[PDB]
A = this chain, B = another copy of it.
Amino acid sequence: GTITSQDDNVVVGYWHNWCDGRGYQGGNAPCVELKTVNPQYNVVNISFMKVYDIAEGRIPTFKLDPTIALSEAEFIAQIDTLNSQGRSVLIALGGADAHIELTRGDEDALAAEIIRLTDLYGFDGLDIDLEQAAITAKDNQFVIPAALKMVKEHYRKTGDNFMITMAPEFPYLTANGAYTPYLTELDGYYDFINPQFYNQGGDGLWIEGVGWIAQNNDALKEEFIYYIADSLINGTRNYHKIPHDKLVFGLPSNIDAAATGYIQDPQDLYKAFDRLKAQGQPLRGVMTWSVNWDMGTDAANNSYNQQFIKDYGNFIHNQLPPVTDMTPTLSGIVDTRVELDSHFDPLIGITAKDYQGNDITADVTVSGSVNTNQVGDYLLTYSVSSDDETTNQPRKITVYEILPAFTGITDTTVVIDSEFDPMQGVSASHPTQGDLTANITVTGEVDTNVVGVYELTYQLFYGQDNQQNMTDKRIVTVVTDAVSDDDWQVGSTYVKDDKVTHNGATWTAQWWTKGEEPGTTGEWGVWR
């Protein structure tokens, strides 16, 4: 068959390229022929494209496990059967222990291997299903989208829609998270995202109305499904926006398929999707790990016998076709702090796209204005319109000021008759105004000919018209060069005629003394 894409809702199901996987609860997932997969799975994702051996280089590939008992030719043939039934088969890039660590430059070779693989096997597209380390390893965030653009474009040249999907774990979908670049770069290119709402344990979100809603809380599954989707489809509560027509809810097929996340009561899902529909935002489908688990056995060797597709197949397919959200996007906008009197350009770094990823940065308009000449806050609003929709985003610009700093104003002692220059070693500076040393004034003088304490106040005038000012003080002590009688010690013993300095005077002992303070022994005492 040829490139078969889906225009209506999807029920996506992953297909293990290996046999006898072990379940989180002791159960078993056999390998299955493609042709045995329930027709209601209209997207089947071959798992996984990966690096098989670093000795083959960095570009991941696909190699069928022969023990699934499908020849290469027969595998191609079962793909062809699915296609002739109108169903899609994707290659899923990633999975555990994928050893995908791409460098800048690798985008050309990756694209070529993707196309090679799609032409040989008859794949209809590619699901980005990166494991943790791989989301961010080396230049993956750049190489994988760059290559995927080239691939989407190759097949658009011949009139085909090569599909692009992604399976991020939901906690990665916050506005500034690790999946950002995949979602923004492939904006307009991707066909839908199927996040994994499972294996994240107590992770979840806070709904200012009703509290904390955890992905593993079975009492509040309906609220989990609804608020997490509502958040994604409106880009609220700190999630990157994924339009409802492009959102597929990923689940474990049963308790053996994932550690946490399985929906115990399907009603919770039916009701959550029904509420989303009621607000005019029906979702695009559901996804599951995996067809094998839906066909596996639990640990008492009892057969799961298709329970997942029994629960959700008819529910998802019996719905209207999706209605495209055509709102455009704004990128690069972040509240920003600017130094007083810097040049500020409101457009720099800001870009926009229409809903199919065309660049429409030129159409961006800005209201509000910044005065960098006055400290304070200024609100800008950016807006852009296209295909009869509009998006806006605010931006806070705060203008602020930094105080200059003095250096070299420390208290110092100088010897009588020295020369003292109040400015030697003294300067001032500011980060944008520079060397302000010439803007400093000195109040007070030092008389080096006269022992004593001289207090100097340094003033710095600065800013526009030198109308700002700071102040600091310094004490300069002019001390005597001349040697004197040693200071009296409370503990020392003194002899008649021994002399000491104490409290500014010189005193002579009239006899033997210990511990009597000169000045305290009255008119006729030991110290005169």
Q: Is A237 a contact of B178 with CB atoms below 8 Å?
A: no
Interface residues of A in 374-416 (CB under 8 A from B): 377, 379, 381, 390, 392, 394, 396, 400-402
Q: Is B279 a contact of A208 with CB atoms below 8 Å?
A: no
Please name all residues of chain B whose beta carbon is closer than 8 Å to the beta carbon of A433 when the two chains form the complex: none
Interface residues of A in 328-381 (CB under 8 A from B): 331-332, 334-335, 337, 349, 377, 379, 381
Interface residues of A in 437-487 (CB under 8 A from B): none
Query: Which among B180, B209, B349, B402 is the interface contact of A349 at CB below 8 angstroms?
Result: B209
Please name all residues of chain B whose beta carbon is closer than 8 Å to the beta carbon of A280 when the two chains form the complex: 337, 400-402
Please name all residues of chain B whose beta carbon is closer than 8 Å to the beta carbon of A491 when the two chains form the complex: none
Given contacts A377-B390, A390-B377, A431-B278, contact A206 B178 (CB under 8 A): yes
Per-residue interface assignment for chain A, residues 241 to 282, with 1 indicating a CB less than 8 Å from any chain B CB and 0 otherwise: 000000000000000000000000000000000000011110
- Name the residue on B nearest A400 (C-beta): B280
Segment at the B interface, from A1-9, A169-177, A421-429: A169-177
Q: Is B202 a contact of A133 with CB atoms below 8 Å?
A: yes
Given contacts A202-B133, A202-B136, contact A212 B278 (CB under 8 A): no
Given contacts A209-B349, A402-B278, A431-B278, contact A176 B237 (CB under 8 A): yes
- Name the residue on B nearest A327 (C-beta): B377
Q: Is B238 a contact of A176 with CB atoms below 8 Å?
A: yes
Task: Provide the bound-state CA to CA distance between A332 and B209, in Å.
Answer: 8
Task: Provide the bound-state CA to CA distance between A214 and B140, in Å.
Answer: 14
Asked if A30 is at the interface (CB within 8 A of a chain B CB), the reply is no
Instruction: Looking at the assembled complex, report how far the CB atom of A339 sits from the nearest CB atom of chain B, in whole angstroms.
Output: 8
- Name the residue on B nearest A334 (C-beta): B236
Task: Provide the bound-state CA to CA distance between A208 and B204, in Å.
Answer: 25
Asked if A211 is at the interface (CB within 8 A of a chain B CB), the reply is yes
Asked if A200 is at the interface (CB within 8 A of a chain B CB), the reply is no
Please name all residues of chain B whose beta carbon is closer than 8 Å to the beta carbon of A204 when the two chains form the complex: 136, 178
Please name all residues of chain B whose beta carbon is closer than 8 Å to the beta carbon of A133 when the two chains form the complex: 202
- Name the residue on B nearest A392 (C-beta): B379
What 4 additional pairs, Cβ within 8 angstroms, besides A177-B238, A208-B331?
Answer: A174-B174, A178-B204, A178-B206, A181-B206
Interface pairs (10), CB distance under 8 Å: A133-B202, A136-B212, A175-B237, A176-B205, A177-B205, A177-B206, A208-B331, A280-B337, A280-B402, A379-B392
